[PDB]
Amino acid sequence: GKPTVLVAEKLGAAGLALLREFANVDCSYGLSPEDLRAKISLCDALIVRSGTKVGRDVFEASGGRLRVVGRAGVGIDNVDLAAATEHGCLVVNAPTANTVAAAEHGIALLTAMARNIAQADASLKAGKWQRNKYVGVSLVGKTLAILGFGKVGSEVARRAKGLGMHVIAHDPYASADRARAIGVELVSMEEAMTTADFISLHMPLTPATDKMLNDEAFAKMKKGVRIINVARGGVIDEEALVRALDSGVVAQAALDVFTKEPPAADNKLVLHGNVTVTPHLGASTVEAQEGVAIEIAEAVIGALK
Amino acid sequence: GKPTVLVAEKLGAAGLALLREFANVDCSYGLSPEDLRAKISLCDALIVRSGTKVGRDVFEASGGRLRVVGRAGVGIDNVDLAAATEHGCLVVNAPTANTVAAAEHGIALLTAMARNIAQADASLKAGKWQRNKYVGVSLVGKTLAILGFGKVGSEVARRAKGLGMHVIAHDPYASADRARAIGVELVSMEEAMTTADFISLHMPLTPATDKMLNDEAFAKMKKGVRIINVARGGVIDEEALVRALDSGVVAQAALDVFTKEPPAADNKLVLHGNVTVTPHLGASTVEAQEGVAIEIAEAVIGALK
């Protein structure tokens, strides 16, 4: 009746001040596998965002006590979730506030990839002024294709049919009901490769869809198609987007996630004209700061009853 | 039988093909006010986008014959209509194809400003990596006050409520039915200064509005308000936008249009962290390139009946 929780990484003071109301809080951020292993032993719950090595060894190390683990935010594959339920351990994540701030930061990438809000604000801050150089295109009647109709890339579609596009998605595991409701149509894979002016990636990087965007799939697309990637940057074979952009098969690209974050400074899509990159800012809104902080706080507490 | 039309400025290729169908077409782009005067004398129609030396002096030089003159684009005040009024001249503009893709490039300035898509893509192409500097804001439950419920600001409300915002607009001239129809509430002026998380300018620069936004104006606003000017930059007393972006009353500002274009290099709004400046790109989309070209072509062809 004074439970105890390890905060492994920095966390929103909205949240922490909840936990300090129903627990004891260890805010020892960033701990070597050792400090964790020695700490885990003595604490009923652990909370982590995509950065703490949680896996078999951390699980064994605790021996009872550790009843529930809270992952802060988007992904989950942080934790070896197999050992979780195995050593009888609960696993709760925080995905409502980080989906918003995600589907938001993609809309912001698509609209601003289309009008060159970057390279223009570049040349004008750089003393230049070439209106003929940075002439946008028009996300209205333009078919947008979405790969991975998850929670993110559906709250994207929700938004893009508000901008007025004809939006389609492709994911075998998406209920034709929830897609037809939000206003989307569910269509085949090559119907989404070909017939698209805008492409929005939302596929989990697995050995099943890795390097999917190679050079066999760039030819299928309509030439001049535009790509926005905000969910697992490995799914693109980056050295073919380096080449469909230079050649002209892909018109423009706007990438938030990468194969290796941070990509080396030579990295050819990071340094390029038709690209507009942000450094996994996907969920970086001050409202999903407080929002994920509070919602795990509320999750942990619930499962730690 | 064989009417005749002067094209003063470069005009879209589709429409020129339209004009050569029902006229002779002299595309004499960039005429000295003197050549204009001598030419106007012999032609039934003159067409001109934002930026041609038309006025009383040109009106008189033509002495009849010049029935109609078309402003290739949104603007209708490019010239002294008072003399066309006075000279039996007709006056036709392009009030639609440039309408859409201005509302568009408006939105895209709001969204790319919120998530710092410019200042971010910049420093990553600049070999930095600071996921913590370029932290956004979440345009969702947020109030967007649209100053001026023209055909521009309306169709920005259209998109903005689709990103899911609370949009109010204030222009004493828009029937509240045309407002409540698209889903927007009309309210007062100070209920737009004070309650706005986002302020979109769509005021034409009536003298009355020249330097409206001044330090009195900025003090009224909620601190943290973001200002997307995409209409006519004279309305902002730039020396004070600079001192609320600096002093932190204005959060960020996305500016497409300026007091004087192309501005002084050293212009503090042009060169500023919290400002995203594109250069009057408000129209530069190829669906309004061809779109305006063909609509005023259409517009003159009729007025020339």
Numbering used by the authors:
A (entry chain B), B (entry chain A): 83 to 387
Sentences copied from the publication:
To elucidate the molecular mechanism underlying enzymic activity, we first purified the full-length DEK20 for crystallization. However, no crystal was obtained due to relatively flexible interactions between RBD and SBD. Consequently, we purified a truncated version (residues 1-387, referred to as DEK20WT), which includes only the SBD and the NBD. DEK20WT forms a homodimer, with each monomer composed of 1 NBD and 1 SBD. Both domains exhibit conserved architectures: the SBD contains 5 α helices and 5 β strands, while the NBD consists of 7 α helices surrounding a central β sheet. Indeed, both the superimposed cofactor (NAD+/NADH) and the substrate (3-PGA) from human 3-phosphoglycerate dehydrogenase fit well within our structure. The 3-PGA is situated in a cleft between NBD and SBD, stabilized by a series of positive residues such as arginine and histidine, while NAD+ occupies the binding pocket formed by the NBD. Interestingly, a conserved residue His at 284 among different species was located between NAD+ and Ser282. In the structure of DEK20WT, Ser282 formed a hydrogen bond with His284 (3.2 Å) keeping the imidazole group of histidine away from NAD + . Correspondingly, the decreased enzyme activity of DEK20(S282L) was also restored by the H284A mutation. These findings demonstrate that Ser282 is critical for enzyme activity, facilitating its interaction with His284 to keep His284 away from the cofactor, NAD+.
